[PDB]
């Protein structure tokens, strides 16, 4: 629901929704229209 | 102690940073810790 959401809150007040207690879906994040930029500042992105 | 490096757990850099920056950070740990030995080694030599 995060990356596929229709609308996002504007950058002045931005969408905060919790992702919790769950198995990280990054395995499925591979196939998509992908991304303008994909970045991890405090980790190696392969470590997700 | 951080000694100016991002963290004092030697492998919690390595998760965060790609090595070539860690190689810069781990210096400030080594350089920090190393110096911290001599200061301890000396204080033993003097006390001894």
From Swiss-Prot, chain B:
Changing residue 14 to F: In strain: Omicron/BA.1. It comes from the Viruses. Subunit of the fusion protein that is processed upon entry into the host cell. Mediates fusion of the virion and cellular membranes by functioning as a class I viral fusion protein. Contains a viral fusion peptide that is unmasked after S2 cleavage. This cleavage can occur at the cell membrane by host TMPRSS2 or during endocytosis by host CSTL. In either case, this triggers an extensive and irreversible conformational change that leads to fusion of the viral envelope with the cellular cytoplasmic membrane, releasing viral genomic RNA into the host cell cytoplasm. This is Spike protein S2'. The gene is S. The chain holds residues 968 to 1015 of 1273 of the full protein.
